[PDB]
Homo-oligomer: A and B are copies of this chain.
Amino acid sequence: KIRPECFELLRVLGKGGYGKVFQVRKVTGANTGKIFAMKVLKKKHPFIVDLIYAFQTGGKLYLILEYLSGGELFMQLEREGIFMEDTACFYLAEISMALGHLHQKGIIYRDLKPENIMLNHQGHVKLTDFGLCKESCGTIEYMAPEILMRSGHNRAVDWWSLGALMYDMLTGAPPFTGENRKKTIDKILKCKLNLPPYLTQEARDLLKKLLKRNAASRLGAGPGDAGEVQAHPFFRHINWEELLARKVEPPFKPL
């Protein structure tokens, strides 16, 4: 049944990660004509991109993931920067739900860069489960706090990234950019978050609590996870059942 020849290559969508991701028409099979995204590796949630087929062959693992028309519409809305606060609150809210579910299933994203945020024909968020996403007694009075809290491998990494993303959606750039990779990484680690004057009172409060250097105190790091972050006043206008239902109208649907 389903094998690599069941597909014809239309265009390349990205080198994204290791392996190329192709757009594709299914030639044979039941879905003849239907368009998919096929991710090749050289070897159910409304906000998670559905996987359809998966097969192994001549040393190449194939992934036939649903195709998303507004698949790059986010990375373009941020180039126009037409993002207003209330506009961004929508995407951050759906992503927060996407992160919460990935967390319950014990998955951390780590990435969460605007280039990793896709949209569907309706305009809602869709994430993946990349190859950069990871999974999750003597006397402790002498060991560092980072060891006691499983650093860089717990789900607080994602909430920092939610902030960084939010920060970029409301200003035009990420919190700690530098003239080169070295200076950037250092400005990141050494911090000192600068919040512009236009950011609202709720926006800045959330930004300060997501971009807290101390992961332990970082918002969303508690056991309530996304419940902690969704409860922020910045999200007061969101109705989570209506959002989860995709019954909330996205301000930007790829026409």
Contacts and interface: CB of A to CB of B under 8 A. Distances in A.
Nearest to A109: B143
Contact of A189 (B141, B161, B216): B216
Nearest to A116: B142
A215 interface: yes
A177 B141 contact: yes
Given A110-B147, A214-B213, A140 B184 contact: yes
Copies in the complex: 2
A148 interface: yes
A85 interface: no
A176 B142 CA distance: 8
A139 B115 CA distance: 9
Contacts of A177: 141
Interface stretch (A5-13, A21-29, A152-160, A232-240): A152-160
Contacts of A174: 141-142
A190 B175 contact: no
Contacts of A165: 142
Residue among A142, A149, A214 with the highest chain B CB neighbour number at 10 A: A142
B157 A215 contact: no
A73 to B, nearest CB: 13
A110 to B, nearest CB: 6
A20 interface: no
A93 interface: no
A112 interface: yes
Given A140-B184, A145-B160, A145-B189, 13 more contacts: A112-B142, A141-B164, A141-B175, A142-B164, A142-B168, A143-B157, A144-B215, A145-B188, A146-B156, A146-B157, A146-B215, A147-B152, A148-B188
6 contacts: A113-B139, A141-B177, A143-B164, A144-B152, A148-B188, A152-B152
